[PDB]
Structure formats: C-alpha cells, structure tokens
Design an enzyme around this catalytic site. Structure first.
Site, PDB file in Angstrom:
ATOM      1  N   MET A   1    -107.714 -97.880 -52.628  1.00 22.40           N
ATOM      2  CA  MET A   1    -107.154 -98.171 -52.023  1.00 22.40           C
ATOM      3  C   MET A   1    -106.726 -97.569 -50.525  1.00 22.40           C
TER       4      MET A   1
ATOM      5  N   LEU B   1     -98.758-102.272 -48.661  1.00 19.11           N
ATOM      6  CA  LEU B   1     -98.614-101.707 -49.857  1.00 19.11           C
ATOM      7  C   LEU B   1     -98.014-103.041 -50.415  1.00 19.11           C
TER       8      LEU B   1
ATOM      9  N   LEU C   1    -101.002-107.737 -55.362  1.00 19.49           N
ATOM     10  CA  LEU C   1    -100.250-106.454 -56.096  1.00 19.49           C
ATOM     11  C   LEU C   1     -98.954-106.945 -56.839  1.00 19.49           C
TER      12      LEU C   1
ATOM     13  N   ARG D   1     -88.686 -95.902 -49.164  1.00 21.39           N
ATOM     14  CA  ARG D   1     -89.613 -94.535 -49.556  1.00 21.39           C
ATOM     15  C   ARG D   1     -90.381 -93.760 -49.296  1.00 21.39           C
TER      16      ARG D   1
ATOM     17  N   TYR E   1     -96.904 -86.169 -51.108  1.00 22.00           N
ATOM     18  CA  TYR E   1     -97.661 -85.840 -50.746  1.00 22.00           C
ATOM     19  C   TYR E   1     -97.653 -84.471 -50.451  1.00 22.00           C
TER      20      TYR E   1
ATOM     21  N   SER F   1    -103.610 -87.538 -49.119  1.00 24.12           N
ATOM     22  CA  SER F   1    -104.578 -87.692 -49.230  1.00 24.12           C
ATOM     23  C   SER F   1    -106.190 -87.614 -49.178  1.00 24.12           C
TER      24      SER F   1
ATOM     25  N   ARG G   1    -107.196-100.329 -48.839  1.00 28.85           N
ATOM     26  CA  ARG G   1    -106.688-101.635 -49.221  1.00 28.85           C
ATOM     27  C   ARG G   1    -105.724-101.201 -47.922  1.00 28.85           C
ATOM     28  N   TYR G   2    -105.232-100.322 -48.141  1.00 29.69           N
ATOM     29  CA  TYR G   2    -104.235 -99.852 -47.020  1.00 29.69           C
ATOM     30  C   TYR G   2    -103.939 -99.280 -46.049  1.00 29.69           C
TER      31      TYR G   2
ATOM     32  N   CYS H   1    -106.667-106.148 -61.975  1.00 29.65           N
ATOM     33  CA  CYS H   1    -106.281-107.168 -60.306  1.00 29.65           C
ATOM     34  C   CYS H   1    -105.523-107.023 -59.745  1.00 29.65           C
TER      35      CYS H   1
ATOM     36  N   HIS I   1    -103.089 -94.658 -64.696  1.00 28.99           N
ATOM     37  CA  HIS I   1    -102.009 -94.567 -63.645  1.00 28.99           C
ATOM     38  C   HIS I   1    -101.529 -96.375 -64.491  1.00 28.99           C
TER      39      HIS I   1
ATOM     40  N   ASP J   1    -108.193 -86.571 -56.201  1.00 29.92           N
ATOM     41  CA  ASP J   1    -106.888 -86.260 -56.225  1.00 29.92           C
ATOM     42  C   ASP J   1    -105.953 -86.601 -56.199  1.00 29.92           C
TER      43      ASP J   1
ATOM     44  N   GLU K   1     -99.738 -85.943 -58.693  1.00 27.73           N
ATOM     45  CA  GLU K   1     -99.151 -85.231 -59.652  1.00 27.73           C
ATOM     46  C   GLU K   1     -98.405 -85.629 -60.945  1.00 27.73           C
TER      47      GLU K   1
ATOM     48  N   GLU L   1     -95.698 -80.096 -63.547  1.00 27.90           N
ATOM     49  CA  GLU L   1     -97.173 -80.222 -62.579  1.00 27.90           C
ATOM     50  C   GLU L   1     -96.576 -80.209 -61.226  1.00 27.90           C
TER      51      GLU L   1
ATOM     52  N   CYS M   1    -107.863-113.516 -65.922  1.00 29.56           N
ATOM     53  CA  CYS M   1    -106.516-113.330 -66.617  1.00 29.56           C
ATOM     54  C   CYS M   1    -106.182-114.743 -67.434  1.00 29.56           C
TER      55      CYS M   1
ATOM     56  N   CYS N   1    -102.450-115.858 -65.377  1.00 37.47           N
ATOM     57  CA  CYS N   1    -103.018-115.987 -63.748  1.00 37.47           C
ATOM     58  C   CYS N   1    -101.831-116.538 -63.076  1.00 37.47           C
TER      59      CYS N   1
ATOM     60  N   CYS O   1    -107.554-115.434 -57.131  1.00 34.54           N
ATOM     61  CA  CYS O   1    -108.584-115.179 -58.128  1.00 34.54           C
ATOM     62  C   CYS O   1    -109.587-115.779 -58.823  1.00 34.54           C
TER      63      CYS O   1
HETATM   64  C1  HEM Z   1     -99.487-103.783 -60.983  1.00 38.25           C
HETATM   65  C2  HEM Z   1     -99.866-102.236 -61.299  1.00 38.25           C
HETATM   66  C3  HEM Z   1     -98.919-101.781 -60.265  1.00 38.25           C
HETATM   67  C4  HEM Z   1     -98.040-101.699 -58.987  1.00 38.25           C
HETATM   68  C5  HEM Z   1     -97.181-102.275 -58.872  1.00 38.25           C
HETATM   69  C6  HEM Z   1     -98.543-100.382 -58.522  1.00 38.25           C
HETATM   70  C7  HEM Z   1     -97.458-100.116 -58.053  1.00 38.25           C
HETATM   71  C8  HEM Z   1     -97.985 -98.886 -56.358  1.00 38.25           C
HETATM   72  C9  HEM Z   1     -96.581 -98.134 -55.490  1.00 38.25           C
HETATM   73  C10 HEM Z   1     -95.411 -99.514 -55.329  1.00 38.25           C
HETATM   74  C11 HEM Z   1     -97.492 -97.064 -54.560  1.00 38.25           C
HETATM   75  C12 HEM Z   1     -96.493 -96.791 -53.855  1.00 38.25           C
HETATM   76  C13 HEM Z   1     -96.120 -95.884 -54.500  1.00 38.25           C
HETATM   77  C14 HEM Z   1     -94.219 -95.462 -54.753  1.00 38.25           C
HETATM   78  O1  HEM Z   1     -93.870 -96.331 -54.039  1.00 38.25           O
HETATM   79  O2  HEM Z   1     -94.230 -95.414 -56.001  1.00 38.25           O
HETATM   80  C15 HEM Z   1     -98.204 -96.591 -55.396  1.00 38.25           C
HETATM   81  C16 HEM Z   1     -99.372 -96.213 -55.281  1.00 38.25           C
HETATM   82  C17 HEM Z   1    -100.435 -95.329 -55.844  1.00 38.25           C
HETATM   83  N1  HEM Z   1    -101.120 -96.330 -57.412  1.00 38.25           N
HETATM   84 FE1  HEM Z   1    -100.276 -98.160 -57.701  1.00 38.25          FE
HETATM   85  N2  HEM Z   1     -99.642 -99.847 -58.893  1.00 38.25           N
HETATM   86  C18 HEM Z   1    -100.394-100.366 -59.663  1.00 38.25           C
HETATM   87  C19 HEM Z   1    -101.487-100.481 -60.543  1.00 38.25           C
HETATM   88  C20 HEM Z   1    -102.544 -98.468 -59.827  1.00 38.25           C
HETATM   89  C21 HEM Z   1    -103.319 -99.152 -61.330  1.00 38.25           C
HETATM   90  C22 HEM Z   1    -104.186 -99.693 -61.923  1.00 38.25           C
HETATM   91  C23 HEM Z   1    -103.864 -97.854 -60.379  1.00 38.25           C
HETATM   92  C24 HEM Z   1    -104.836 -96.611 -60.866  1.00 38.25           C
HETATM   93  C25 HEM Z   1    -106.438 -97.666 -60.929  1.00 38.25           C
HETATM   94  C26 HEM Z   1    -102.468 -97.019 -59.334  1.00 38.25           C
HETATM   95  C27 HEM Z   1    -103.166 -95.978 -57.943  1.00 38.25           C
HETATM   96  C28 HEM Z   1    -101.796 -95.402 -57.480  1.00 38.25           C
HETATM   97  C29 HEM Z   1    -101.915 -94.220 -56.802  1.00 38.25           C
HETATM   98  C30 HEM Z   1    -103.855 -93.554 -56.903  1.00 38.25           C
HETATM   99  C31 HEM Z   1    -101.378 -94.603 -55.631  1.00 38.25           C
HETATM  100  C32 HEM Z   1    -100.712 -93.446 -54.746  1.00 38.25           C
HETATM  101  C33 HEM Z   1     -99.974 -92.022 -55.531  1.00 38.25           C
HETATM  102  C34 HEM Z   1    -100.662 -91.731 -56.221  1.00 38.25           C
HETATM  103  O3  HEM Z   1    -101.645 -90.888 -56.224  1.00 38.25           O
HETATM  104  O4  HEM Z   1    -100.402 -91.320 -57.374  1.00 38.25           O
HETATM  105  N3  HEM Z   1    -102.294 -98.059 -59.213  1.00 38.25           N
HETATM  106  N4  HEM Z   1     -98.162 -98.116 -56.441  1.00 38.25           N
HETATM  107  C1  LIG Z   2     -90.399 -99.449 -57.928  1.00 38.58           C
HETATM  108  C2  LIG Z   2     -90.367-100.914 -56.150  1.00 38.58           C
HETATM  109  C3  LIG Z   2     -88.890-100.686 -55.647  1.00 38.58           C
HETATM  110  C4  LIG Z   2     -89.232 -99.201 -54.626  1.00 38.58           C
HETATM  111  C5  LIG Z   2     -88.051 -98.825 -54.441  1.00 38.58           C
HETATM  112  O1  LIG Z   2     -86.697 -99.482 -54.229  1.00 38.58           O
HETATM  113  O2  LIG Z   2     -87.404 -97.925 -53.613  1.00 38.58           O
HETATM  114  C6  LIG Z   2     -89.962-102.301 -57.041  1.00 38.58           C
HETATM  115  C7  LIG Z   2     -89.677-103.254 -56.092  1.00 38.58           C
HETATM  116  C8  LIG Z   2     -91.097-103.777 -56.152  1.00 38.58           C
HETATM  117  C9  LIG Z   2     -91.300-104.164 -57.670  1.00 38.58           C
HETATM  118  C10 LIG Z   2     -92.295-105.015 -58.747  1.00 38.58           C
HETATM  119  C11 LIG Z   2     -91.953-106.212 -58.063  1.00 38.58           C
HETATM  120  O3  LIG Z   2     -91.195-106.775 -58.111  1.00 38.58           O
HETATM  121  C12 LIG Z   2     -92.980-107.427 -58.260  1.00 38.58           C
HETATM  122  C13 LIG Z   2     -92.906-106.940 -60.625  1.00 38.58           C
HETATM  123  C14 LIG Z   2     -91.361-107.856 -60.850  1.00 38.58           C
HETATM  124  C15 LIG Z   2     -91.677-107.871 -62.638  1.00 38.58           C
HETATM  125  O4  LIG Z   2     -91.331-107.796 -63.697  1.00 38.58           O
HETATM  126  C16 LIG Z   2     -92.097-105.753 -63.088  1.00 38.58           C
HETATM  127  C17 LIG Z   2     -93.410-105.155 -62.252  1.00 38.58           C
HETATM  128  C18 LIG Z   2     -93.944-105.469 -60.841  1.00 38.58           C
HETATM  129  C19 LIG Z   2     -95.083-104.767 -60.182  1.00 38.58           C
HETATM  130  C20 LIG Z   2     -91.955-104.661 -59.370  1.00 38.58           C
HETATM  131  C21 LIG Z   2     -92.456-103.017 -59.874  1.00 38.58           C
HETATM  132  C22 LIG Z   2     -91.060-102.053 -59.113  1.00 38.58           C
HETATM  133  O5  LIG Z   2     -89.941-102.192 -59.782  1.00 38.58           O
HETATM  134  C23 LIG Z   2     -91.076-102.697 -57.880  1.00 38.58           C
HETATM  135  C24 LIG Z   2     -92.883-102.379 -57.024  1.00 38.58           C
HETATM  136  S1  FES Z   3    -103.833-111.868 -61.886  1.00 37.60           S
HETATM  137 FE1  FES Z   3    -105.986-111.659 -63.336  1.00 37.60          FE
HETATM  138  S2  FES Z   3    -107.270-112.804 -62.962  1.00 37.60           S
HETATM  139 FE2  FES Z   3    -105.578-113.138 -61.477  1.00 37.60          FE
END
Ligand code: HEM
Ligand SMILES: C[C@H](CCC(=O)O)[C@H]1CC[C@H]2[C@@H]3[C@H](O)C[C@@H]4C[C@H](O)CC[C@]4(C)[C@H]3C[C@H](O)[C@]12C
Ligand code: FES
Ligand code: HEM
Ligand SMILES: C[C@H](CCC(=O)O)[C@H]1CC[C@H]2[C@@H]3[C@H](O)C[C@@H]4C[C@H](O)CC[C@]4(C)[C@H]3C[C@H](O)[C@]12C
Ligand SMILES: C[C@H](CCC(=O)O)[C@H]1CC[C@H]2[C@@H]3[C@H](O)C[C@@H]4C[C@H](O)CC[C@]4(C)[C@H]3C[C@H](O)[C@]12C
Ligand SMILES: C[C@H](CCC(=O)O)[C@H]1CC[C@H]2[C@@H]3[C@H](O)C[C@@H]4C[C@H](O)CC[C@]4(C)[C@H]3C[C@H](O)[C@]12C
Ligand code: FES
EC number: 4.98.1.1
Lengths: 359, 359
Positions: free
Chosen positions: B12, B28, B34, B51, B59, B66, B100-101, B132, B199, B276, B279, B283, B339, B342, B347
């Site tokens: 990512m 992102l 995603l 955000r 960070y 990062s 990715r981002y 996925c 995560h 890294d 946290e 922590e 999935c 899905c 996909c």
């Molecule tokens: C569909 C599921 C997932 C969603 C919706 C998601 C969403 C997000 C979002 C919105 C952030 C940006 C920061 C924030 O606004 O808080 C973030 C950061 C991050 N995500 Fe995910 N994420 C998902 C799955 C994962 C998975 C499976 C991993 C790990 C392998 C992962 C690893 C990270 C990392 C490393 C960051 C950067 C922040 C940190 O270091 O903790 N995410 N993710």
């Molecule tokens: C946390 C973030 C909003 C942050 C903010 O408003 O500052 C919100 C906005 C988009 C949301 C996502 C989107 O609504 C898409 C998904 C909807 C599902 O019902 C939950 C997971 C799901 C992946 C949501 C996770 C979380 O509620 C998100 C990521």
């Molecule tokens: S969301 Fe998992 S194969 Fe499409």
C-alpha cells in the site's frame, strides 16, 4: 488387572433417539459455561420445551438421532487397545464417555472413575479445536463436580485440552476429502470448491477472545498443505440460530453465493466436529435446492464423511494420549491463559485445578 | 546485461513525510477495490482532508512518516542479489516498487517495467496473508492499468499472491519473538503473553468471504509451533476505524482486559505487516498507559521488531521468487476462487488476467 489409567472422552453428546431431545436441550440451555441468560434456571426449561419440536424434526431428517455415543465408544475401544501396547507402564487403560448434555454425563463418568480406583485420570477433549463453549465447558464441569461434592479428587488429573493440528487428524481429513472428491466427475474434480464448514460462534464470544476461530483456521491450513493445495477453498461457518451477529460467512449463504458466481461443484468438510450432525439448508431442503439448481444451475454438492470409525482416527487418539503421558504435561500452555475479556469466574478455577495437580 | 526478470513488490505504501499524508489518504478513500462509498469521487476528498490532521499526528508519533519505501528497497536489493545467483537462467533480476497510494505508484511501476523491455514480470505481494482489500486491490490495479490504457501487456505476467506460512518468514517471526522475550526480566519470561496483532477487517468484509483471517491464523500457528508453544498466546486485531463492527477482539481492549485479569507482561507481534507502522493506544498514549499501570499494575508491554531489514527476510523473498519461477505457476490455486459473496466485477477479470498469461 484393575484399571490403572482412565481416559475421559469429553464431548457435548447428542440425543440417541428423538425422545431424548428435550433433556438434551434442557441441559444445554442451563449451561452457564455455554451461554448467559437472565433467570436462566427458569428460562432454560421454557426454551428447551418450546424448541424440542424443531430440533426433533432436524434429527428426524438425519436418521432419528445422533450416533455420537456408538462412534465414541468404538473409537474408545480402539484407542485403549493401542494404548495397552504403546504404554505398557500405564496399562491397563480404560476409556470413559463424558457427555455434557446426555447420559453418560460428565459427572456420572467422574463418579465411576473414582470408584474404579484409578491412579491416573486424563480429561481428553474430543473437540480438536478449543472453544470456551465446548472444551471449556466440559473442563469446567470437572472442576464444578468436585467443588459441588465438596471433596478432592482421589485420582491424579491432567488434560489434553486441544489438538487442532495433530498429524494423524490431518491425515484423516485429507483422506476423507480425497475419497469424496473421487465421487465428482473426473472432468470436474479440479474445479470443485472445498468448503470447510465449522460451527459458528456468536460475535460476542469471538470478540471476548475465544481461541476457536484461530485454531480451526490452523486445522484448515494443515489439511490443505497435506492436499498440496489441489483445489481452492474457503473456511465458512454454520450458524443460523438467532438474530444477533455470529461469525461469518455463513455456510448456507456461501453455497448460494458460490453457485451464483459460477461454482457449480462444492465439497463440504466438517472440519470441527468429528461426528455426524445436523446438515445445512441446501442439503435438507428440497425447495431451496431446487430454487438454487434452477437459478444458478448447481451441479454437485457433497459432504465428506465424518471421521467416525476410521481406524487411523483411533490411532490418532491413542497417539495423542501416549504423547501426553510421555510429556508428563498437565495441560497445554494455552489453557494457562484465559480469554482477554473472560467474565466467567469458573474458568480461572478450572485452570488452577489442572495446573496444580499432583505430579 | 539488461534486466530480464522484473519483480514488482506490491504494497500500500505510506506517506514518507507528514506532507504526504493528504495525498496518501485521498488515493486510499478513492480505491473502489478497498471500499465503496456514495458519490465517492466527492466524499473521498472530503474524508481525506478531515482525517489528514489526525493521521499526520499518528505518523509524527512514530518518527514523522512511514519507512516503508526505505525498507522495501533494502529488501528488494537483498532479494535481487540472491536471485542472480540462485536463478542464472532468469537473471539479471530487477525489483520495482509498486505502492497503491503513494509514489512510486503501481501504475508508474508497470509503465517503467514495460519500458525496460522485460521478458518476465512477477507481481509479488508484500502482504504474506491475502485480503481482497490489500493484495486484491494491488492485483486489480494491475488489471485496471492495462484496461484503462487499452493495451495488452508486453511482458509475461504471473503472481505470488500469498505466502502466509513460508518457512523462512516463520523463522523470522520466531527469531524476533525470541529476541524480544530476552528483553523481559528472566523471572517473568515464562509469564509473558504473546499477543499476535494483525490489522482488523470490517465484519462486512469478513462475512463476504475474505481469506485474510484464516491465513493470518495459519501464520500464527506456524510461528507458535516453531517456538514450541513456549508461551501462551492470542491472535487479536488492531487499529479498526469507524463505528461499524470489525473483527475482534481489539488489541487495545485485549491488553486492558489481560492486565485486569493478572497478565502484567505482554509481547505484541506485528504478524501481518512486515514494516514499522502506527502503534496501538497503550503504546502511544501516556494517559492510558498510566491509568492502566495504576489500575492493574502493568509491568512490561513490548513489541517485537518488524522484519524491516533482517537478511533472513531477504532470503525468504528470494526463495519465494525462485520457487515461483521453478514451478512455472501463474498464481496460487486460491486466487482462482473469488469470495463467495464478492460484488466487485473486477476481481474475476483480474483472476483471468493472471491465469491466462502466456507461459
Ligand atoms: C477492507 C478492510 C480495510 C479497510 C476499510 C482499511 C482502511 C484503512 C484506512 C481508512 C486507513 C487510513 C487511515 C485512517 O483513516 O485511519 C488505513 C490504513 C492502514 N491500513 Fe487498512 N484497511 C483495511 C484492511 C487492512 C489490512 C488487511 C491491512 C494489513 C495487512 C491494513 C493495513 C493498514 C496500514 C498499515 C495502514 C496505515 C496505518 C498504520 O500503519 O496502521 N489495512 N486502512
Ligand atoms: C472510518 C471512515 C470515516 C473516517 C472519518 O469520517 O473521519 C469510514 C468512511 C468510509 C467507511 C467504510 C465504507 O462505508 C465501506 C464499508 C461499509 C461497511 O458497512 C463497514 C466497512 C466499510 C469499509 C466502512 C469502514 C468505515 O466506516 C469507513 C472507512
Ligand atoms: S471481494 Fe474477494 S474476490 Fe472480490
Ligand atoms: C458460544 C457458542 C455456541 C452457542 C451459543 C451454541 C449453541 C447451540 C444451541 C442453542 C444448540 C441447540 C440447537 C438449537 O436450538 O438450534 C446447539 C447445538 C449444537 N452445537 Fe452449538 N453452540 C455454540 C458453539 C458450538 C461449537 C463451537 C460447536 C462445535 C465444535 C457446536 C456444535 C453444536 C452441535 C454439533 C450441535 C447439535 C446440533 C447440530 O448438529 O448442529 N456448537 N448449539
Ligand atoms: C434480554 C436478553 C439479553 C440480555 C443481555 O444481553 O444482557 C435476551 C437473550 C435471550 C432472549 C429471549 C430468547 O431469544 C427466547 C425468546 C425469543 C422471542 O423472539 C422473544 C422472547 C424471548 C424470551 C427472548 C427475550 C429477550 O430478547 C432475551 C431474554
Ligand atoms: C437462539 C436462542 C433462542 C431459540 C428460541 O427461542 O427458540 C437464543 C436464546 C439464548 C441466546 C444466547 C444468550 O442470550 C447468550 C448470548 C448473548 C449474546 O448477546 C448473543 C450470543 C448468545 C449466545 C445468544 C445467542 C442466541 O440469541 C440465543 C442462543
Ligand atoms: C451512507 C454510507 C454507508 C453506505 C453503506 O454502508 O451502504 C456512510 C459511510 C461513509 C459515511 C460518511 C463519512 O463518515 C464522512 C462523513 C462523517 C460525518 O459524521 C457524517 C457525514 C459523512 C459524509 C458520512 C455520511 C454517511 O454516514 C456515510 C457516507
Ligand atoms: S470465557 Fe474463555 S477463559 Fe473464560
């Protein structure tokens, strides 16, 4: 020779005949180690009576009852025979059936074990993967028994509380999957989806730290590694019992989803319960199966055979007990750690019960 | 000699400096692989701006950005070094970073790979466990690239889409856990709880069939087997965001819960992200740390070091690519199954993109 080492085979049990359903459900809904209900002692009896018709119907659909007692006994006999040869120093061995909700009850088994004047008693869970709802409840029942009779064990206790990746268990699963794959058309065998199906847990239990999902996942990985990833797979969960959230994906919805997405051949694998049990919607409902076959054109949905009387399984059981004895362990390292959000005061007591045992 | 085999390291990415946070979040929230949002093209920008401050702060707490780019490059150099000796027939090897981002973006990397006139291209995910949301999105981005440009690839593609139990990856985790355990007082090392922290995923994603939870669980089991179950453990999930239901138990709540129950020594393990990252609450927040220490008396909460620049990890990466080449595989058998629920049409397209590649 008088029995020297006793092996208490722990499982939930099942109603032998349709008439045994009510008491089975009564004891189940009264189990505070399984679920917490307000005024449980009064509410459980009601739920049991009211739910008996539905469950009796479900058991009628699979033969009229559960074969768990016969299968457990057969496995117990095979296990003991091997153990008498494997561990002559702890022989003779004797197995005891300790079912949580039907006779012979856990309490009745302990009572008999003490009367037989055993020198060693082993609480051997028949659930390979640990859940506080299954093995945890059965182990808590052993502690509760002695704390109920206000007396200390006259036997040396220890427990085999989990075995999610035992090599012989994995070999059995792999063998049954391969045997079932042979039932699909040769030209389609490679396209069959292996759907590992384990009973689900309420999300409230998953989120408090239950060990089960991670251990079931480990069993799945070991089985697929043994099969050399010959077919694609997914681990899904069978729930469909209440309104609130349970761990998914749900087995039924997954079968429907897969078919709607082009996967017409599916192999269900009972990865977390070694005996025949109630099947899924698409295996028992004609209407649903027909609706699915007409909308998505499903071609073949089969289920791998339960471990039942597989001699290699008896060998797995004996191997586990033998290794347990040789290691001189009282329980797994995992049992020494309660769920991060455990709110059941008995869990800690049961843990201490085993870790503090003489020898 | 000019580059022959290109290894696209997919991840990512992360904001190198606090000034890169905004763009990082924008891309992102715009990622439809995603998440899907109403009027996403409009909401993504809004959410990103809102955000950015919070994330910049996060960070700043870990150094000011990062370090993923530096670590990925170091690992890539080490990997290439070994590959040139391991597989002369496919040398020279060259690694490319495809984030990715953030820059270098996946699209930018593919463009450079094509300009280098490579013969073979390998989409090597840097997430050991497949989701996925992570590997899936990165792979979809490759398909989307060629579909948006309207041209077919000029290189032969294949992908290493998962490797949750690679033996050297497991050895690395075990090694880091052991070295961190050495940092605890000798008299308490045996009491330390190993908390594997991955995560979390929204339950909506878990329930649609995401492969991630089961694969992460497999990594955990393999690591504990290597460690010979020396300490008790639990697999918990960190950093959930938003008010919707996510897979638990939560790492934060689990640390508090364990302490309240007598576990004063905890070791956190970054089991699903090799570099890294941000946290957890206990922590970073001094307020909560103090309250916890005064309320339950925490003694030691430590975190195992990320794989970062461990030479054994570079050897793991090279071994994976080497075996991949020798196998002639185009992707894992698992990638051929979407999935069960899905709802992303891309996909299936991405899957076919890889399974249909020349050679
Ligand atoms: C569909 C599921 C997932 C969603 C919706 C998601 C969403 C997000 C979002 C919105 C952030 C940006 C920061 C924030 O606004 O808080 C973030 C950061 C991050 N995500 Fe995910 N994420 C998902 C799955 C994962 C998975 C499976 C991993 C790990 C392998 C992962 C690893 C990270 C990392 C490393 C960051 C950067 C922040 C940190 O270091 O903790 N995410 N993710
Ligand atoms: C946390 C973030 C909003 C942050 C903010 O408003 O500052 C919100 C906005 C988009 C949301 C996502 C989107 O609504 C898409 C998904 C909807 C599902 O019902 C939950 C997971 C799901 C992946 C949501 C996770 C979380 O509620 C998100 C990521
Ligand atoms: S969301 Fe998992 S194969 Fe499409
Ligand atoms: C805390 C979690 C669990 C709860 C609340 C629960 C609850 C129940 C209930 C209420 C029934 C009675 C049937 C009904 O009324 O529909 C039942 C049956 C059953 N349960 Fe569970 N259960 C849990 C976990 C498990 C686990 C982890 C396993 C597997 C190893 C399991 C295996 C079974 C079996 C085999 C039956 C008998 C009927 C059948 O074949 O499905 N349960 N459970
Ligand atoms: C209120 C209580 C949950 C309390 C809690 O979580 O703290 C829930 C759990 C079991 C539920 C009961 C059981 O589901 C059995 C009955 C189901 C009926 O649909 C409603 C009445 C019924 C009797 C329910 C009343 C109420 O919703 C109960 C009693
Ligand atoms: C489905 C069953 C009621 C069946 C019926 O009324 O015919 C109800 C009654 C007892 C309920 C359980 C108990 O309330 C204990 C748990 C409460 C949690 O909030 C959900 C899971 C939990 C495990 C409940 C699952 C489900 O709602 C149960 C099992
Ligand atoms: C409605 C949609 C979820 C749709 C779905 O799950 O199918 C959710 C997910 C992202 C949410 C948005 C994000 O959280 C960003 C904003 C947060 C504010 O507190 C409300 C408006 C706000 C713009 C939210 C509106 C709405 O609750 C959204 C758009
Ligand atoms: S509920 Fe799991 S240890 Fe008590």
């Amino acid at each position: 020779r008088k029995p020297k080492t006793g092996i208490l085979m722990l499982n939930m049990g099942g109603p032998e005949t349709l008439g045994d359903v009510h008491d089975f459900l009564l004891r189940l809904f009264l189990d505070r180690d399984l679920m917490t209900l307000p005024i449980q002692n009064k509410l459980a009896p009601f739920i049991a009576k009211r739910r008996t018709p539905k469950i009796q119907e479900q058991y009628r659909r699979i033969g009229g009852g559960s074969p768990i007692k016969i299968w457990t006994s057969k496995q117990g006999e095979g296990m003991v025979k091997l153990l008498d040869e494997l561990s002559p120093n702890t022989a003779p061995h004797k197995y005891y059936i300790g079912f949580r909700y039907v006779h012979p009850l856990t309490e009745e088994a302990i009572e008999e074990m003490e009367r037989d004047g055993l020198e060693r008693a082993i609480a051997f869970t028949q659930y390979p993967q640990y859940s506080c709802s299954t093995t945890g409840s059965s182990l808590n029942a052993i502690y509760r028994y002695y704390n109920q009779v206000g007396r200390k064990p006259t036997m040396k206790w220890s427990t085999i509380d989990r075995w999610p990746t035992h090599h012989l268990l994995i070999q059995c699963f792999a063998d049954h999957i391969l045997k079932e794959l042979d039932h699909f058309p040769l030209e389609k065998r490679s396209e069959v989806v292996i759907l590992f199906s384990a009973h689900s847990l309420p999300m409230s239990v998953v989120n408090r730290g239950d060990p089960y999902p991670q251990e079931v996942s480990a069993t799945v990985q070991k089985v697929m590694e043994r099969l050399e990833y010959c077919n694609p797979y997914r681990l899904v969960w069978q729930s469909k019992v209440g309104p609130m959230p349970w761990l998914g994906p749900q087995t039924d919805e997954s079968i429907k989803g897969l078919c709607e997405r082009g996967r017409k051949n599916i192999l269900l694998v009972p990865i977390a319960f070694t005996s025949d049990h109630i099947e899924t919607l698409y295996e028992l409902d004609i209407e649903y199966s027909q609706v699915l076959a007409k909308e998505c054109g499903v071609e073949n949905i089969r289920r791998a055979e339960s471990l039942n009387g597989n001699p290699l399984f008896s060998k797995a059981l004996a191997d586990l007990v033998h290794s347990h004895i040789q290691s001189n362990e009282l329980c797994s390292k995992q049992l020494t750690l309660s769920c991060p959000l455990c709110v059941n005061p008995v869990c800690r007591e049961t843990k201490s019960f085993f870790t503090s045992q003489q020898l």
